[PDB]
Design a protein around this nucleic acid. Structure first.
Lengths: 61, 58
DNA sequence: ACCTAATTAGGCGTAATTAG
DNA sequence: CTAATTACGCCTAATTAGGT
């Protein structure tokens, strides 16, 4: 345990992620690193986001 | 329990803050809360009750 | 009687957590 | 990792207790 509150993403970081979601919806470490760098977000947030998007796109349909 | 008071000046800063952003993000609420000196509850509540007033007549 | 600022219970997205 | 669930934050609108 080490505190983990919500973030809120903004259309910009979102758009950047969505743009990065194409090309590779399952990015390895480096790609997530530079995405974190481009966005400022914590790695885990990028990761959990991508997980969630994969889940979302598979969710339907 | 308060009824945590308002003061003119803070409220001045506040309607001044109302412009540019009808309903802001936590950054705004924070720095605003700092300039005011009251808890985020206090800020969000006023913003809310203003959110339930501007439309009340409009 | 006004003013307003606090709950109060409810619904909505979706990030974060958990099961598996 | 996936697939399902939970928790949070973020907003509403109708009360609920204040104040000069």
């Amino acid at each position: 345990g080490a505190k983990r509150p919500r973030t809120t993403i903004t259309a910009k970081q979102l758009e950047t992620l969505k743009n990065a979601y194409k090309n590779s919806p399952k990015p390895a470490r480096h790609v997530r690193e530079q995405l974190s760098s481009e966005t400022g977000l914590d790695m885990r947030v990028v990761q959990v986001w991508f997980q969630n998007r994969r889940a979302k796109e598979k969710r339907l349909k």
